[PDB]
Amino acid sequence: MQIFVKTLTGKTITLEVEPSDTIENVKAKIQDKEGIPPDQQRLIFAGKQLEDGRTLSDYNIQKESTLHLVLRLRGGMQIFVKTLTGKTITLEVEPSDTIENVKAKIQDKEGIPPDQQRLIFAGKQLEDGRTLSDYNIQKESTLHLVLRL
């Protein structure tokens, strides 16, 4: 089971894969093969950005499927969002971003509706319309993420 990951310049990276291999795994094989760090890699198939926690079968990737690899330099503001199971999810954000916005980023990466997310910082349940600066959330600050009861 071969798949083809193609870069902007039409460079092909060919990968031997299995249905139950995750996207994180595919990104690791790319790092191994090309020297590109997984955190700079974005993978696209059927016009969908592919999520680390999902498998190739999840996305209906079969033999000789073609994926597109898109690369990012990255800017200067990350925060950590931490579940009480200990999964740390890192996010690229700006001071003027609202909690609503962060919650939409969490939706993408985890599949959790915003109305079900509770974000906690400095011991407070964070409000959707207030900003990171409002709460003095800074570079490499950690927010707790917990579910609606």
CATH fold of the domain at 1-73: Ubiquitin-like (UB roll) (3.10.20)
Grouping H, G, I as helix, E, B as strand and the rest as coil, residue 118 is strand
Instruction: Report the run of H or E that residue 74 belongs to, with start and end.
Output: none
Domain boundaries, the chain: 1-73, 74-149
In whole angstroms, give the CA distance from residue 142 to residue 122.
Answer: 10
Instruction: List, in order, residues 6 or more apart from 39 with CB less than 8 Å away.
Output: 74
In whole angstroms, give the CA distance from residue 143 to residue 122.
Answer: 9
CATH fold of the domain at 74-149: Ubiquitin-like (UB roll) (3.10.20)
Instruction: List, in order, residues 6 or more apart from 71 with CB less than 8 Å away.
Output: 7, 8, 36, 40, 41, 42
Instruction: List, in order, residues 6 or more apart from 44 with CB less than 8 Å away.
Output: 50, 67, 68, 69, 70
Long-range pairs for 97-106: beta carbons < 8 A, 24 or more residues apart:
97/131, 97/132, 98/128, 98/129, 98/130, 98/131, 99/126, 99/127, 99/128, 99/129, 99/130, 99/131, 100/128, 100/129, 102/132, 102/143, 103/128, 106/81, 106/145
Instruction: List, in order, residues 6 or more apart from 2 with CB less than 8 Å away.
Output: 14, 15, 16, 17, 63, 64
Instruction: List, in order, residues 6 or more apart from 26 with CB less than 8 Å away.
Output: 3, 5, 15, 17, 43, 56, 67
By the 8 A CB rule, do 7 and 41 touch?
Answer: no
In whole angstroms, give the CA distance from residue 146 to residue 116.
Answer: 8
- 66: which 2 tokens? 């073609």
- 59: which 2 tokens? 């996305």
Experimental method: X-ray
Residue 135 CA to its chain's centroid (Å): 24
Dihedral, CA of residue 125, residue 129, residue 135 and residue 136, to nearest 10: 140
Asked if 1-73 and 74-149 have one fold, the answer is: yes
Name residue, tokens 């919650």.
Answer: 103
In whole angstroms, give the CA distance from residue 115 to residue 113.
Answer: 6
